[PDB]
Amino acid sequence: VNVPKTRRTFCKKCGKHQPHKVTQYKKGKDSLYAQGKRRYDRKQSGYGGQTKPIFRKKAKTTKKIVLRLECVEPNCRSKRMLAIKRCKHFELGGDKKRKGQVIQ
Amino acid sequence: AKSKNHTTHNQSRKWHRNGIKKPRSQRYESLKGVDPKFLRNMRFAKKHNKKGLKKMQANNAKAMSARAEAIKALV
Amino acid sequence: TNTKGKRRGTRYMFSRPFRKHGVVPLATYMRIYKKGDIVDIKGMGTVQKGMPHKCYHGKTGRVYNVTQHAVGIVVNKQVKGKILAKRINVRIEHIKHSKSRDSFLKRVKENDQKKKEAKEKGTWVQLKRQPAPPREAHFVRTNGKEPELLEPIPYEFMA
Amino acid sequence: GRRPARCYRYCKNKPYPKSRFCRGVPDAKIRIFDLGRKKAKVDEFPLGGHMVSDEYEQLSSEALEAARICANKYMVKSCGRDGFHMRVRLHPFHVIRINKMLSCAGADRLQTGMRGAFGKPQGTVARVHIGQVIMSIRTKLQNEEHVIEALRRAKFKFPGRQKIHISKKWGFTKFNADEFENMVAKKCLIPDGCGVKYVPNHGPLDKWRVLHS
RNA sequence: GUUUCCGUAGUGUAGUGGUUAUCACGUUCGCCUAACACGCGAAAGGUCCCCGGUUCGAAACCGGGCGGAAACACCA
RNA sequence: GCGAAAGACUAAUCGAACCAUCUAGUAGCUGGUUCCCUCCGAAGUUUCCCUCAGGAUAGCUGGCGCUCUCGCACACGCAGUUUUAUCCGGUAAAGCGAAUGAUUAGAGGUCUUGGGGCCGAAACGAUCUCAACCUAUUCUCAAACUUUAAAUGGGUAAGAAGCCCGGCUCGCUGGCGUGAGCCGGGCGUGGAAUGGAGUGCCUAGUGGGCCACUUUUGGUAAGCAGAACUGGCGCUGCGGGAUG
RNA sequence: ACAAAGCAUCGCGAAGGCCCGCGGCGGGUGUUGACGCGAUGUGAUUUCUGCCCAGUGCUCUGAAUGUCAAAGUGAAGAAAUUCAAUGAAGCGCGGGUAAACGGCGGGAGUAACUAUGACUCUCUUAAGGUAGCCAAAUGCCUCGUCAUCUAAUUAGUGACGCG
RNA sequence: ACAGUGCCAGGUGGGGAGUUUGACUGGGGCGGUACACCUGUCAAACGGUAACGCAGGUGUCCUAAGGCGAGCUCAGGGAGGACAGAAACCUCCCGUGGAGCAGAAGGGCAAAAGCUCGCUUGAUCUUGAUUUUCAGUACGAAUACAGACCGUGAAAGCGGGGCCUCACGAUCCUUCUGACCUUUUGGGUUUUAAGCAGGAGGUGUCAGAAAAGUUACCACAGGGAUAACUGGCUUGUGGCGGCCAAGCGUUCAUAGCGACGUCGCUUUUUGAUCCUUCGAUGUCGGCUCUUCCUAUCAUUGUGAAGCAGAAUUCACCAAGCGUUG
RNA sequence: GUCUACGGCCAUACCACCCUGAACGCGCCCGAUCUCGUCUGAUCUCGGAAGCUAAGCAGGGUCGGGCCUGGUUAGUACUUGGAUGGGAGACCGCCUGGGAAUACCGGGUGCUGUAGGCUU
Ligand SMILES: [Mg+2]
Ligand SMILES: [Mg+2]
Ligand SMILES: [Mg+2]
Ligand SMILES: [Mg+2]
Ligand SMILES: [Mg+2]
Ligand SMILES: [Mg+2]
Ligand SMILES: [Mg+2]
Ligand SMILES: [Mg+2]
Ligand SMILES: [Mg+2]
Ligand SMILES: [Mg+2]
Ligand SMILES: [Mg+2]
Ligand SMILES: [Mg+2]
Ligand SMILES: [Mg+2]
Ligand SMILES: [Mg+2]
Ligand SMILES: [Mg+2]
Ligand SMILES: [Mg+2]
Ligand SMILES: [Mg+2]
Ligand SMILES: [Mg+2]
Ligand SMILES: [Mg+2]
Ligand SMILES: [Mg+2]
Ligand SMILES: [Mg+2]
Ligand SMILES: [Mg+2]
Ligand SMILES: [Mg+2]
Ligand SMILES: [Mg+2]
Ligand SMILES: [Mg+2]
Ligand SMILES: [Mg+2]
Ligand SMILES: [Mg+2]
Ligand SMILES: [Mg+2]
Ligand SMILES: [Mg+2]
Ligand SMILES: [Mg+2]
Ligand SMILES: [Zn+2]
């Protein structure tokens, strides 16, 4: 699909519609010190073998794309999430699609 | 190891052995499900019935004594 | 196995009857409903917002709620035995006033009237309905003809 | 070739007409539903001989084939190549099926038995009700006996039973034959090649102005 | 019977993503040759298997069929 | 371990010894499961499950009660009913000179046009012909077609929680009124037939089903496979069908 | 069937090869030393031993700009830390090897009866089955075809070979 | 100063260990997916209903292919109009939908839901209630409201994605976002971590195990709930036999035959099916021996012939006795 | 009798053609200054009042097509229950009740609501 780089929508903090700056979301680097990892470290540690399950059966070929909106006005800058239905193709700011032209 | 796949065979018997019951309906059923702007108002109507009970009580004796006069004028 | 889809088999049910595909007549959303009134759900294809679900199509129920263009309505739905009095939200285009109620309230307005009067007389009037009685011995009169003689007619293969 | 007509004699399953839902149907065996002098007039062939079914059954396409031919052969005969018109009034329309012959080689090793029991089209078949016509012939009133015997031979290519009956209509129309001449002069009926057009007191008056002019 | 694979010039075969069609040989015309070869220059040739659909447009994308081929039909 | 190799041999034991213990190992799977009498009395269906020989939850069952009713001349309530009103329906049938889809025949049409002809240099010229269309017609069809359109059948409704007056309250609704909510009075058997009704706890067994009328899906057919509706058999003897 | 002589590869100069053991500076081969020990393959003699290193192996004083950890070093921070540079073996890359595991194809036209086809065209691959041998204990079609042996032979022997 | 042993790290490791190697399934295996969904039907006119019953579709795509608002009119046909022809472009007339509405079908749609423009983000923030599968649990999807912020239009209104019916995902874990939030523990300040509330990373066996084979050396619990014999039911196929009769038979339908069709029998063929048996009914042939059937090859007696004789076919009563090396 | 404005039920109102419309209105119609919109004042927006019922519209007309209703088709097709009814079977008959659809014949062809006109 295609989405525009900006959009005006509700900014939770201001209580009003305000211009936002759209960008898609990429996961963060995993901590190594979150409780889950620390636990999984020193259980998967020692003469035991593998402990927790692991996936080798993948089914779907796409993930829900998530927009990471953020307030454009300063002092708010309060980022917010937005999920959208899946797609195996995705862009930003791409070419408003031009009704009634010649397809060369 | 194939098996039967479905049936509604003697089911009519079973759920009619205790005699299918039309749901017992009382007066004064629940207001849950009515639109909030109704209740959010009708609760204020119900909450301030008392403010204005003096009018109601005296105006009740007015018709109670006018119809104690209406039944006595018949007598 | 069959599909659970919300509008399966309605191919023939929600279909606008015949020579009526088009604008909904404006009377159907300018009659009023108020809580207590009895209503018979009847879906309709043209309006898809606020449709009922096919198991209520043809059923009646009283009204308990009234929003801007829909009506909350309690009907009975039988499920493997136990009948559940369940309340659905149906936009008005799929709803009529059921005259099922209105035979009575006309027997009522007449019963209450025929009792207030004939009370100044004291003569007891038949207020209750009463089923079709035996047809009450009468006469038949042929005037100057005997009846017409009927005979079973001789078979012949028509084809 | 084909199972004997036994197995496909009774109307068991709902009609299976040739449509987009069953395809690859072998073309019906019988093709020509009328022969003789189909270029005749109504005014020269007053004998509506029929062959009427008496049982609710099916008729194979290949049966209607032989029943027509063997009637064309006791006709053009005593009658002559011009002196009749024969109509078959059952188009094989319902498609008959065959589970795929449970084909096996040698003794066997496998056939799957019944998985996907649904079979292919094998041919076509007519549905017939009691008191519904199969064949109809028309000749001169002179030639009655030869319609009776030509239809009597076609019975022997058909399963079940069927009575031979001589109609009270004029040829192939729907109009009782004692009335034709009366409804032709005064033009309640107008010759239209084989059939005939019933003209009522309905239409525009100029439509009349053509007739009785 | 089930599961695959193809079909493109006279022939064997390339090829693309949906805008174009190749190579080699064959063949036709010249040129060298005394004459053939060989060599050099030019040439002409296919509904891209038959179908219906999708599409702006299909040879190429789907669905059916036809023809040629390949792979399974084990435990008793 | 040992094997010139067969998985051979290792104290009648070998694709992995014998002895005791851990050990009453585990079993959704076979087998058994001990006195009488009395009363009530099923299921083989629902959804979920590494579920399909098992469970979980639904039902169906029993036990325990309770709340009341009044046969104590002085009853409301319910119902595998039926009437009386009143909506709902797309099956049988029907139709296809009504749509869609098939399809026969002729008459009618240079409709259009053609591809062959025959008489024509050619010519809608003449006569044919066959194709496709269409103007009135006609033969026969549709489970995945429909103008119509049953029978059986599904809803409600047949009053006291109902009507009819009077009056208060509102942050909703509005030119005013709506509407709903409250308080206060005024009035009784509202179709037939039947029967005492309501409600809460625990809970076993079951979750292989089978047959017949009618309807009906595969199949050629089956004592075949698979549904509907009721009834049975399982759970149940007796008279009859010789036997079952 | 195994074994077998014979033929053949393969590791190893002793802090070695193979191997045992729970552990020792422990043991077997070894009271040994390449005409020895260990590890395999085929199976006397005779006659031969054809192509293929693309695949999987094995291996190679082979480049390791591919990657790559513990420590190690470097930097920011207040510190847990965080981020840098670097880089061993094996992996990636490049040689060798089939008496290592194993592999060794499909189409048309063309000769004077017909047929067949020396001959000539494409295509593909890592090479495309060479010497031989065959309806063999290896051939589906199959009681293959011819001959011989029989009165008569799905048997036998002998030839034929798109096997 | 390395060999070597002590301890950590990476590699290698069926030499060894433990374990797994789905379900449905006309027995299973191989084939499919009826394993989560969606249309039309089957389905017997409320709803609901089965099979590896049909005919099909889904794991999408959309910055507009959404939200308003205007503005028009579509497929197809006719008649015209320079190049221009069955097809370009223009113009008029007819045009209930025969087009179009991203996709399967089914419904729905006309000064629309279709096409063309201008303005946009209601595809946003937030409680509950209800419908749909249903246990009347979730998830998904949907329906009405209410509270905010808006878009649009003169406005009434409409709009919290896509005209309606499908296009999706728990716990745990991980990440991102939100509140001057809470805990971080004997106080206090900073990091860090743990909470709370929403999104995402995924389980397609789609209420959600982290998983390859082989056993003809085999084992155990069971199963006639599940095959391989027999037997039953059935009879397609196999065999045997009628009816009609177009024809063959020089001529002549029927001496002998017999097409196109059609009605049966039979259980010496194979199938289908799975009722009986899995605490076992010994599962091919041949040898021997008995008996029975007749759908008669011979012989007794006969009728038929396209029967002169001979020979030979066709048919009847007939299973007495034969049918070999 | 009738129209105009806004309508309800949506063909008894449609469609095809034919005839007649006094006065009010509805319309055609005449212009592009302003408002507004176009390639074009063609449509839309606006300023009008010289003409005409030519057409829309109204009203009628057609042995008119359509629709709306009756009759017939027909107690036919079909069906709820029932039988130790018939039939080798397909199917069929009867008992107890309900009861359709074409072709074919008739009849009809818009009813009205509120507010204003005109016929004073
Ligand atoms: Mg470790
Ligand atoms: Mg058991
Ligand atoms: Mg239906
Ligand atoms: Mg059980
Ligand atoms: Mg070797
Ligand atoms: Mg070699
Ligand atoms: Mg190599
Ligand atoms: Mg060779
Ligand atoms: Mg030899
Ligand atoms: Mg011998
Ligand atoms: Mg030989
Ligand atoms: Mg192992
Ligand atoms: Mg299984
Ligand atoms: Mg039903
Ligand atoms: Mg619009
Ligand atoms: Mg809102
Ligand atoms: Mg839309
Ligand atoms: Mg401290
Ligand atoms: Mg073996
Ligand atoms: Mg072995
Ligand atoms: Mg069994
Ligand atoms: Mg058997
Ligand atoms: Mg002859
Ligand atoms: Mg069974
Ligand atoms: Mg025994
Ligand atoms: Mg005999
Ligand atoms: Mg103008
Ligand atoms: Mg006019
Ligand atoms: Mg006029
Ligand atoms: Mg008329
Ligand atoms: Zn903000």
Short mmCIF file of all heavy atoms in Angstrom, two decimals, chain F residues 99-100, chain H residues 74-76 95-101 108-110:
data_model
loop_
_atom_site.label_atom_id
_atom_site.label_comp_id
_atom_site.label_asym_id
_atom_site.label_seq_id
_atom_site.Cartn_x
_atom_site.Cartn_y
_atom_site.Cartn_z
P A F 99 -38.82 -13.28 -21.86
OP1 A F 99 -38.45 -12.69 -23.17
OP2 A F 99 -39.04 -14.74 -21.72
"O5'" A F 99 -37.68 -12.85 -20.84
"C5'" A F 99 -37.22 -11.51 -20.78
"C4'" A F 99 -36.38 -11.26 -19.56
"O4'" A F 99 -37.07 -11.77 -18.38
"C3'" A F 99 -35.03 -11.96 -19.52
"O3'" A F 99 -34.04 -11.29 -20.27
"C2'" A F 99 -34.73 -12.02 -18.04
"O2'" A F 99 -34.30 -10.75 -17.56
"C1'" A F 99 -36.12 -12.30 -17.47
N9 A F 99 -36.37 -13.74 -17.36
C8 A F 99 -37.35 -14.49 -17.97
N7 A F 99 -37.31 -15.76 -17.66
C5 A F 99 -36.24 -15.82 -16.79
C6 A F 99 -35.69 -16.90 -16.11
N6 A F 99 -36.20 -18.13 -16.25
N1 A F 99 -34.63 -16.66 -15.31
C2 A F 99 -34.17 -15.40 -15.21
N3 A F 99 -34.60 -14.30 -15.81
C4 A F 99 -35.65 -14.59 -16.58
P U F 100 -33.13 -12.14 -21.27
OP1 U F 100 -32.17 -11.19 -21.89
OP2 U F 100 -34.07 -12.92 -22.12
"O5'" U F 100 -32.34 -13.14 -20.31
"C5'" U F 100 -31.37 -12.66 -19.40
"C4'" U F 100 -30.76 -13.76 -18.56
"O4'" U F 100 -31.78 -14.33 -17.68
"C3'" U F 100 -30.21 -14.97 -19.29
"O3'" U F 100 -28.94 -14.75 -19.90
"C2'" U F 100 -30.20 -16.02 -18.19
"O2'" U F 100 -29.14 -15.78 -17.27
"C1'" U F 100 -31.52 -15.71 -17.49
N1 U F 100 -32.65 -16.51 -18.04
C2 U F 100 -32.79 -17.83 -17.65
O2 U F 100 -32.02 -18.36 -16.87
N3 U F 100 -33.86 -18.50 -18.20
C4 U F 100 -34.80 -17.99 -19.09
O4 U F 100 -35.72 -18.69 -19.52
C5 U F 100 -34.57 -16.62 -19.44
C6 U F 100 -33.54 -15.95 -18.92
P C H 74 -24.08 7.13 -21.24
OP1 C H 74 -23.53 8.00 -22.31
OP2 C H 74 -25.45 6.61 -21.39
"O5'" C H 74 -23.09 5.90 -21.05
"C5'" C H 74 -22.11 5.91 -20.02
"C4'" C H 74 -22.13 4.64 -19.21
"O4'" C H 74 -23.31 4.61 -18.36
"C3'" C H 74 -22.22 3.35 -20.00
"O3'" C H 74 -20.99 2.97 -20.58
"C2'" C H 74 -22.76 2.37 -18.96
"O2'" C H 74 -21.73 1.95 -18.08
"C1'" C H 74 -23.73 3.27 -18.19
N1 C H 74 -25.12 3.13 -18.70
C2 C H 74 -25.85 1.97 -18.41
O2 C H 74 -25.32 1.09 -17.72
N3 C H 74 -27.11 1.83 -18.89
C4 C H 74 -27.63 2.81 -19.62
N4 C H 74 -28.88 2.65 -20.08
C5 C H 74 -26.91 4.00 -19.93
C6 C H 74 -25.67 4.12 -19.46
P A H 75 -20.89 2.74 -22.17
OP1 A H 75 -19.47 2.85 -22.57
OP2 A H 75 -21.90 3.60 -22.85
"O5'" A H 75 -21.34 1.22 -22.36
"C5'" A H 75 -20.59 0.17 -21.78
"C4'" A H 75 -21.31 -1.15 -21.86
"O4'" A H 75 -22.56 -1.08 -21.14
"C3'" A H 75 -21.71 -1.60 -23.24
"O3'" A H 75 -20.64 -2.17 -23.95
"C2'" A H 75 -22.83 -2.59 -22.96
"O2'" A H 75 -22.30 -3.85 -22.56
"C1'" A H 75 -23.50 -1.94 -21.74
N9 A H 75 -24.70 -1.16 -22.09
C8 A H 75 -24.89 0.18 -21.91
N7 A H 75 -26.07 0.60 -22.30
C5 A H 75 -26.70 -0.55 -22.75
C6 A H 75 -27.97 -0.79 -23.29
N6 A H 75 -28.87 0.17 -23.47
N1 A H 75 -28.30 -2.05 -23.65
C2 A H 75 -27.40 -3.01 -23.46
N3 A H 75 -26.17 -2.92 -22.97
C4 A H 75 -25.87 -1.65 -22.62
P G H 76 -20.31 -1.67 -25.43
OP1 G H 76 -19.13 -2.45 -25.88
OP2 G H 76 -20.25 -0.18 -25.41
"O5'" G H 76 -21.59 -2.13 -26.26
"C5'" G H 76 -21.92 -3.50 -26.36
"C4'" G H 76 -23.35 -3.70 -26.80
"O4'" G H 76 -24.25 -3.19 -25.79
"C3'" G H 76 -23.77 -2.97 -28.07
"O3'" G H 76 -23.36 -3.62 -29.26
"C2'" G H 76 -25.27 -2.87 -27.90
"O2'" G H 76 -25.89 -4.12 -28.17
"C1'" G H 76 -25.38 -2.60 -26.40
N9 G H 76 -25.36 -1.16 -26.10
C8 G H 76 -24.33 -0.48 -25.50
N7 G H 76 -24.55 0.80 -25.36
C5 G H 76 -25.80 0.98 -25.92
C6 G H 76 -26.56 2.17 -26.05
O6 G H 76 -26.25 3.32 -25.69
N1 G H 76 -27.78 1.94 -26.67
C2 G H 76 -28.21 0.70 -27.10
N2 G H 76 -29.42 0.67 -27.67
N3 G H 76 -27.51 -0.42 -26.98
C4 G H 76 -26.32 -0.21 -26.38
P G H 95 -36.00 5.22 -24.65
OP1 G H 95 -37.33 4.93 -24.07
OP2 G H 95 -35.44 6.59 -24.51
"O5'" G H 95 -34.95 4.20 -24.03
"C5'" G H 95 -35.13 2.80 -24.16
"C4'" G H 95 -33.82 2.05 -24.00
"O4'" G H 95 -32.83 2.59 -24.91
"C3'" G H 95 -33.15 2.15 -22.64
"O3'" G H 95 -33.72 1.31 -21.66
"C2'" G H 95 -31.71 1.83 -22.97
"O2'" G H 95 -31.56 0.44 -23.23
"C1'" G H 95 -31.55 2.57 -24.29
N9 G H 95 -31.12 3.97 -24.08
C8 G H 95 -31.89 5.11 -24.18
N7 G H 95 -31.22 6.21 -23.93
C5 G H 95 -29.93 5.76 -23.66
C6 G H 95 -28.76 6.50 -23.32
O6 G H 95 -28.62 7.72 -23.19
N1 G H 95 -27.68 5.65 -23.13
C2 G H 95 -27.71 4.29 -23.24
N2 G H 95 -26.55 3.66 -23.01
N3 G H 95 -28.79 3.59 -23.55
C4 G H 95 -29.86 4.39 -23.74
P U H 96 -34.09 1.90 -20.22
OP1 U H 96 -35.36 2.67 -20.36
OP2 U H 96 -32.89 2.54 -19.64
"O5'" U H 96 -34.40 0.60 -19.37
"C5'" U H 96 -33.67 -0.60 -19.61
"C4'" U H 96 -33.51 -1.38 -18.34
"O4'" U H 96 -33.53 -0.45 -17.23
"C3'" U H 96 -34.63 -2.38 -18.06
"O3'" U H 96 -34.09 -3.42 -17.25
"C2'" U H 96 -35.59 -1.56 -17.21
"O2'" U H 96 -36.45 -2.34 -16.41
"C1'" U H 96 -34.62 -0.74 -16.38
N1 U H 96 -35.16 0.52 -15.89
C2 U H 96 -35.93 0.48 -14.75
O2 U H 96 -36.18 -0.55 -14.15
N3 U H 96 -36.41 1.70 -14.34
C4 U H 96 -36.17 2.92 -14.95
O4 U H 96 -36.67 3.93 -14.47
C5 U H 96 -35.36 2.86 -16.13
C6 U H 96 -34.89 1.69 -16.55
P G H 97 -33.74 -4.83 -17.91
OP1 G H 97 -34.31 -4.80 -19.28
OP2 G H 97 -34.11 -5.90 -16.94
"O5'" G H 97 -32.16 -4.82 -18.06
"C5'" G H 97 -31.31 -4.77 -16.93
"C4'" G H 97 -30.36 -3.61 -17.03
"O4'" G H 97 -31.08 -2.38 -16.82
"C3'" G H 97 -29.22 -3.57 -16.01
"O3'" G H 97 -28.10 -4.26 -16.52
"C2'" G H 97 -28.92 -2.08 -15.86
"O2'" G H 97 -27.89 -1.68 -16.74
"C1'" G H 97 -30.22 -1.41 -16.30
N9 G H 97 -30.90 -0.67 -15.22
C8 G H 97 -31.55 -1.12 -14.09
N7 G H 97 -32.04 -0.13 -13.39
C5 G H 97 -31.70 1.00 -14.10
C6 G H 97 -31.97 2.35 -13.82
O6 G H 97 -32.57 2.83 -12.85
N1 G H 97 -31.43 3.15 -14.81
C2 G H 97 -30.74 2.71 -15.92
N2 G H 97 -30.31 3.66 -16.74
N3 G H 97 -30.48 1.45 -16.20
C4 G H 97 -31.00 0.67 -15.24
P G H 98 -27.47 -5.53 -15.78
OP1 G H 98 -28.56 -6.36 -15.20
OP2 G H 98 -26.40 -5.02 -14.88
"O5'" G H 98 -26.82 -6.34 -17.01
"C5'" G H 98 -27.52 -7.41 -17.63
"C4'" G H 98 -27.60 -7.32 -19.15
"O4'" G H 98 -28.86 -6.72 -19.55
"C3'" G H 98 -26.54 -6.52 -19.90
"O3'" G H 98 -25.33 -7.24 -20.07
"C2'" G H 98 -27.24 -6.20 -21.23
"O2'" G H 98 -27.06 -7.25 -22.16
"C1'" G H 98 -28.72 -6.14 -20.83
N9 G H 98 -29.29 -4.77 -20.82
C8 G H 98 -30.55 -4.44 -21.25
N7 G H 98 -30.82 -3.17 -21.14
C5 G H 98 -29.66 -2.62 -20.60
C6 G H 98 -29.35 -1.27 -20.25
O6 G H 98 -30.05 -0.25 -20.35
N1 G H 98 -28.08 -1.15 -19.74
C2 G H 98 -27.20 -2.18 -19.58
N2 G H 98 -26.01 -1.87 -19.06
N3 G H 98 -27.47 -3.44 -19.89
C4 G H 98 -28.71 -3.59 -20.40
P A H 99 -23.93 -6.47 -20.30
OP1 A H 99 -24.07 -5.59 -21.48
OP2 A H 99 -22.81 -7.44 -20.26
"O5'" A H 99 -23.78 -5.58 -18.99
"C5'" A H 99 -22.51 -5.38 -18.38
"C4'" A H 99 -22.06 -3.94 -18.51
"O4'" A H 99 -23.17 -3.04 -18.28
"C3'" A H 99 -21.00 -3.47 -17.54
"O3'" A H 99 -19.69 -3.90 -17.88
"C2'" A H 99 -21.18 -1.96 -17.57
"O2'" A H 99 -20.58 -1.41 -18.74
"C1'" A H 99 -22.69 -1.84 -17.70
N9 A H 99 -23.34 -1.66 -16.38
C8 A H 99 -24.00 -2.60 -15.63
N7 A H 99 -24.46 -2.14 -14.49
C5 A H 99 -24.07 -0.81 -14.48
C6 A H 99 -24.25 0.23 -13.55
N6 A H 99 -24.89 0.10 -12.39
N1 A H 99 -23.73 1.44 -13.86
C2 A H 99 -23.08 1.58 -15.02
N3 A H 99 -22.85 0.68 -15.98
C4 A H 99 -23.37 -0.50 -15.64
P G H 100 -18.74 -4.55 -16.75
OP1 G H 100 -17.41 -4.79 -17.37
OP2 G H 100 -19.46 -5.68 -16.11
"O5'" G H 100 -18.60 -3.40 -15.65
"C5'" G H 100 -17.98 -2.16 -15.97
"C4'" G H 100 -18.36 -1.08 -14.99
"O4'" G H 100 -19.80 -0.92 -14.96
"C3'" G H 100 -17.99 -1.32 -13.54
"O3'" G H 100 -16.63 -1.04 -13.26
"C2'" G H 100 -18.96 -0.40 -12.81
"O2'" G H 100 -18.54 0.95 -12.93
"C1'" G H 100 -20.22 -0.58 -13.65
N9 G H 100 -21.06 -1.67 -13.15
C8 G H 100 -21.20 -2.92 -13.70
N7 G H 100 -22.02 -3.68 -13.03
C5 G H 100 -22.43 -2.87 -11.98
C6 G H 100 -23.32 -3.17 -10.94
O6 G H 100 -23.92 -4.24 -10.75
N1 G H 100 -23.46 -2.09 -10.10
C2 G H 100 -22.82 -0.88 -10.25
N2 G H 100 -23.10 0.04 -9.32
N3 G H 100 -21.98 -0.58 -11.22
C4 G H 100 -21.84 -1.63 -12.04
P C H 101 -15.77 -2.07 -12.38
OP1 C H 101 -14.37 -1.56 -12.28
OP2 C H 101 -16.05 -3.43 -12.89
"O5'" C H 101 -16.41 -1.97 -10.93
"C5'" C H 101 -16.18 -0.83 -10.14
"C4'" C H 101 -17.26 -0.61 -9.11
"O4'" C H 101 -18.56 -0.99 -9.61
"C3'" C H 101 -17.14 -1.40 -7.82
"O3'" C H 101 -16.17 -0.86 -6.95
"C2'" C H 101 -18.56 -1.31 -7.25
"O2'" C H 101 -18.76 -0.08 -6.58
"C1'" C H 101 -19.41 -1.31 -8.53
N1 C H 101 -20.05 -2.61 -8.76
C2 C H 101 -21.15 -2.91 -7.96
O2 C H 101 -21.54 -2.09 -7.13
N3 C H 101 -21.76 -4.10 -8.13
C4 C H 101 -21.28 -4.94 -9.05
N4 C H 101 -21.91 -6.11 -9.19
C5 C H 101 -20.15 -4.65 -9.87
C6 C H 101 -19.56 -3.47 -9.69
P G H 108 -31.49 -8.04 -5.05
OP1 G H 108 -32.96 -7.98 -4.90
OP2 G H 108 -30.91 -8.39 -6.37
"O5'" G H 108 -30.85 -6.66 -4.60
"C5'" G H 108 -31.04 -6.17 -3.29
"C4'" G H 108 -30.09 -5.05 -2.97
"O4'" G H 108 -28.74 -5.55 -2.88
"C3'" G H 108 -30.00 -3.94 -3.99
"O3'" G H 108 -31.06 -3.00 -3.89
"C2'" G H 108 -28.65 -3.33 -3.69
"O2'" G H 108 -28.71 -2.55 -2.51
"C1'" G H 108 -27.84 -4.59 -3.38
N9 G H 108 -27.23 -5.15 -4.58
C8 G H 108 -27.58 -6.34 -5.15
N7 G H 108 -26.87 -6.61 -6.20
C5 G H 108 -26.01 -5.53 -6.29
C6 G H 108 -25.01 -5.29 -7.24
O6 G H 108 -24.70 -6.01 -8.20
N1 G H 108 -24.36 -4.09 -6.99
C2 G H 108 -24.65 -3.24 -5.95
N2 G H 108 -23.90 -2.14 -5.89
N3 G H 108 -25.58 -3.45 -5.05
C4 G H 108 -26.21 -4.61 -5.29
P C H 109 -31.82 -2.52 -5.21
OP1 C H 109 -33.09 -1.88 -4.80
OP2 C H 109 -31.78 -3.65 -6.18
"O5'" C H 109 -30.89 -1.38 -5.80
"C5'" C H 109 -30.71 -0.17 -5.08
"C4'" C H 109 -29.40 0.48 -5.43
"O4'" C H 109 -28.34 -0.51 -5.45
"C3'" C H 109 -29.30 1.12 -6.80
"O3'" C H 109 -29.95 2.37 -6.88
"C2'" C H 109 -27.80 1.21 -6.97
"O2'" C H 109 -27.31 2.20 -6.09
"C1'" C H 109 -27.37 -0.14 -6.40
N1 C H 109 -27.26 -1.21 -7.42
C2 C H 109 -26.34 -1.08 -8.47
O2 C H 109 -25.65 -0.06 -8.58
N3 C H 109 -26.24 -2.08 -9.36
C4 C H 109 -26.99 -3.17 -9.22
N4 C H 109 -26.83 -4.12 -10.14
C5 C H 109 -27.92 -3.34 -8.15
C6 C H 109 -28.01 -2.34 -7.28
P A H 110 -31.29 2.55 -7.75
OP1 A H 110 -32.34 3.13 -6.87
OP2 A H 110 -31.52 1.28 -8.49
"O5'" A H 110 -30.92 3.68 -8.81
"C5'" A H 110 -30.44 4.94 -8.37
"C4'" A H 110 -30.09 5.86 -9.52
"O4'" A H 110 -29.11 5.22 -10.38
"C3'" A H 110 -31.26 6.26 -10.41
"O3'" A H 110 -31.09 7.61 -10.83
"C2'" A H 110 -31.09 5.35 -11.62
"O2'" A H 110 -31.65 5.85 -12.82
"C1'" A H 110 -29.58 5.23 -11.71
N9 A H 110 -29.15 4.00 -12.36
C8 A H 110 -29.51 2.73 -11.98
N7 A H 110 -29.00 1.79 -12.74
C5 A H 110 -28.27 2.49 -13.69
C6 A H 110 -27.49 2.06 -14.79
N6 A H 110 -27.30 0.79 -15.14
N1 A H 110 -26.89 3.02 -15.52
C2 A H 110 -27.07 4.30 -15.18
N3 A H 110 -27.78 4.82 -14.19
C4 A H 110 -28.35 3.85 -13.47
#
